[PDB]
Amino acid sequence: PALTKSQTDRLEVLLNPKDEISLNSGKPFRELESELLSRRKKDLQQIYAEERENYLGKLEREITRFFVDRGFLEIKSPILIPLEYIERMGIDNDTELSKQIFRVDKNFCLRPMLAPNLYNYLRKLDRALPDPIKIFEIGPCYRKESDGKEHLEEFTMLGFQQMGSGCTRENLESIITDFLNHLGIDFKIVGDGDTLDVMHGDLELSSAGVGPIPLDREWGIDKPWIGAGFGLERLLKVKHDFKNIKRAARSESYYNGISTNL
Amino acid sequence: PALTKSQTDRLEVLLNPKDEISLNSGKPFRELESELLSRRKKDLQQIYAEERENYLGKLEREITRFFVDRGFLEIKSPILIPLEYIERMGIDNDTELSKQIFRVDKNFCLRPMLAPNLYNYLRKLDRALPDPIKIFEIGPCYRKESDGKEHLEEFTMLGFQQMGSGCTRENLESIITDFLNHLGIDFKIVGDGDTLDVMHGDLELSSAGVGPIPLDREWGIDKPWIGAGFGLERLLKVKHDFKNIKRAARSESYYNGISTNL
Numbered sequence: 001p002a003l004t005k006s007q008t009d010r011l012e013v014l015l016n017p018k019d020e021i022s023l024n025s026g027k028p029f030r031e032l033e034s035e036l037l038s039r040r041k042k043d044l045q046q047i048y049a050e051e052r053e054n055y056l057g058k059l060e061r062e063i064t065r066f067f068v069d070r071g072f073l074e075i076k077s078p079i080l081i082p083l084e085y086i087e088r089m090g091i092d093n094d095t096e097l098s099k100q101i102f103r104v105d106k107n108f109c110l111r112p113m114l115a116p117n118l119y120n121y122l123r124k125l126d127r128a129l130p131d132p133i134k135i136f137e138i139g140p141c142y143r144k145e146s147d148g149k150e151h152l153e154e155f156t157m158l159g160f161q162q163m164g165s166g167c168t169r170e171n172l173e174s175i176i177t178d179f180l181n182h183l184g185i186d187f188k189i190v191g192d193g194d195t196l197d198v199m200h201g202d203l204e205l206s207s208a209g210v211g212p213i214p215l216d217r218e219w220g221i222d223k224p225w226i227g228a229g230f231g232l233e234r235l236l237k238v239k240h241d242f243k244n245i246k247r248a249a250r251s252e253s254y255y256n257g258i259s260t261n262l
Numbered sequence: 263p264a265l266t267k268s269q270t271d272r273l274e275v276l277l278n279p280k281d282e283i284s285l286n287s288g289k290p291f292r293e294l295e296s297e298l299l300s301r302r303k304k305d306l307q308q309i310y311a312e313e314r315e316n317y318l319g320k321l322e323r324e325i326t327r328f329f330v331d332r333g334f335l336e337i338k339s340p341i342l343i344p345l346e347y348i349e350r351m352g353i354d355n356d357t358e359l360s361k362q363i364f365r366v367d368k369n370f371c372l373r374p375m376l377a378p379n380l381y382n383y384l385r386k387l388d389r390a391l392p393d394p395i396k397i398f399e400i401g402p403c404y405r406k407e408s409d410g411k412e413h414l415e416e417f418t419m420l421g422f423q424q425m426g427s428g429c430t431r432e433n434l435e436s437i438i439t440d441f442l443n444h445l446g447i448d449f450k451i452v453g454d455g456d457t458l459d460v461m462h463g464d465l466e467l468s469s470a471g472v473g474p475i476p477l478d479r480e481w482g483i484d485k486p487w488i489g490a491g492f493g494l495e496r497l498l499k500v501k502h503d504f505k506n507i508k509r510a511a512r513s514e515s516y517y518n519g520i521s522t523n524l
């Protein structure tokens with residue numbers, strides 16, 4: 001008998017991208033399931049015996065070293081942010097993002113992006129640090145999303161920003177290119193303040209920008225800048241050839257892309 | 263003229279624990295403020311020129327290396343968790359913690375602790391990994407709190423748990439002792455399933471436990487265990503002799519304990 005769709009769904013959960021197994025063959029569900037269960041248990045045993053590091057944590061640490069080594073200051077700013085920061089960012093009711101905010105209490109929200117906190121740090125650090133000011137942050141961000149293989153409601157974003165001298169599109173593309181070649185992730189930069197997107201096929205890895213833009217004034221910024229935001233789970237999805245970004249997420253259902261339901 | 267209380271408050275923001283400056287002296291506010299501003303700008307310049315790492319990020323990475331090296335698997339689990347996990351943990355209306363939860367939407371909350379996710383990982387990994395199972399997680403936790411120099415509403419917690427063989431109070435105290443001696447943090451273990459607290463004077467650094475306890479059954483756990491939870495900002499507060507834990511927090515107001523309002 002052919003596998004049911006439910007049985008195929010179950011096998012897909014246990015299938016990893018490097019497997020050379022095809023579900024289409026005549027072998028019965030129970031034997032395919034037992035084979036994949038054995039493989040995934042061995043995969044977890046090998047992680048536990050050797051490296052023991054979580055993909056998302058390890059990627060954050062690798063990205064951190066890259067940017068610290070390039071002269072960027074590591075920022076850790078609040079995840080629970082004032083709701084007023086959303087409106088200040090120009091996110092009004094005519095934008096998609098206005099409907100995607102997780103509100104907390106009556107005056108706070110889970111941050112959907114890093115830009116407000118990075119703007120505040122640029123303004124404050126400009127009183128103390130020499131030109132140019134280079135900063136970055138990695139951490140959780142939150143958006144309400146429709147179901148989709150490329151979106152999480154709880155994800156992790158890298159944001160970096162440079163302000164002052166050297167804030168050219170060329171320098172921005174050079175940072176992006178060195179960064180993704182360091183990680184081993186294929187990309188194309190697409191673009192015509194200037195804006196550009198970093199694409200892996202149809203998947204957006206990053207949106208980047210060149211300042212100054214009119215919004216800067218509301219944040220007390222009056223210098224040129226360049227910066228970009230990257231989703232870490234999307235980087236992991238591409239690097240490991242996951243079919244669904246849920247394999248890369250903070251999760252109780254997957255560990256380093258391996259099903260925990262064994 | 264003596265300094266006003268408001269002027270003293272302003273100087274205290276700029277005062278760092280290693281400063282050898284006393285505000286009590288006759289010198290005028292403006293000169294004391296200008297001296298402290300110069301010192302704090304130089305402190306930020308030195309960080310930017312040399313290490314560029316954030317105290318909270320760096321501590322997370324150091325703790326991660328300690329536990330990975332000791333055989334613990336690094337977990338990254340959801341911060342936004344089902345509200346049902348709170349009740350399942352035995353947190354009912356007769357507990358303080360029930361009134362401290364940040365609710366999100368109608369069925370989710372910001373996690374106030376790591377225990378639910380660690381229980382779930384122990385249960386699932388017991389199907390794949392050899393005895394004993396050793397896991398840990400570091401990440402944001404959230405609690406509504408009264409104003410106080412030892413509490414944050416947004417903080418970072420280390421949780422570790424071992425399940426199976428070797429789950430003795432002696433082994434638990436040995437992990438705690440090696441860990442805090444590695445970090446260079448003075449402590450006392452106080453205690454009479456068994457429970458114990460790790461104290462720095464009157465400040466609680468950790469609460470730890472030895473299983474099994476009746477609650478385990480609700481989470482599908484039926485093996486002995488040991489574990490503990492530590493607040494990272496409290497570790498930083500003790501290590502750096504901060505007077506208020508706000509100096510150690512995810513923050514827009516302090517960077518590595520240095521005021522950003524210069």
Ligand SMILES: Nc1ncnc2c1ncn2[C@@H]1O[C@H](COP(=O)(O)OP(=O)(O)NP(=O)(O)O)[C@@H](O)[C@H]1O
Pocket residue numbers: 113143145150151152153155156157204205206207229230231232233234
């Ligand atoms: N829901 C999400 N899940 C995972 N990653 C995300 C999510 N939203 C944004 N990101 C990442 O964060 C980066 C910067 O955010 P932003 O440019 O605002 O996203 P976006 O324009 O909404 N992308 P998309 O929703 O795919 O059209 C993106 O390039 C993504 O890599």
Ligand SMILES: Nc1ncnc2c1ncn2[C@@H]1O[C@H](COP(=O)(O)OP(=O)(O)NP(=O)(O)O)[C@@H](O)[C@H]1O
Pocket residue numbers: 375405407412413414415417418419466467468469491492493494495496
């Ligand atoms: N609001 C907070 N801010 C910073 N750290 C915290 C906070 N709550 C708990 N922690 C840390 O997390 C550890 C384990 O949490 P738990 O034992 O539930 O805290 P607790 O018993 O409420 N401590 P306390 O509130 O100081 O009496 C504690 O030992 C603290 O180091």
Ligand SMILES: N[C@H](Cc1cccc(Br)c1)C(=O)O
Pocket residue numbers: 113114115116118158159160161207208209210226227228229230
């Ligand atoms: N907030 C993030 C990060 C960021 C930071 C600075 C400049 C730029 Br462009 C983007 C984003 O959504 O892209």
Ligand SMILES: N[C@H](Cc1cccc(Br)c1)C(=O)O
Pocket residue numbers: 375376377378380420421422423469470471472488489490491492
């Ligand atoms: N949830 C955390 C971490 C934790 C994990 C396992 C056992 C123990 Br005890 C404590 C706490 O509040 O202590």
Ligand SMILES: [Mg+2]
Pocket residue numbers: none
């Ligand atoms: Mg989007």
Ligand SMILES: [Mg+2]
Pocket residue numbers: 204206207
């Ligand atoms: Mg975009």
Ligand SMILES: [Mg+2]
Pocket residue numbers: none
């Ligand atoms: Mg408490």
Ligand SMILES: [Mg+2]
Pocket residue numbers: 466468469
């Ligand atoms: Mg306690």
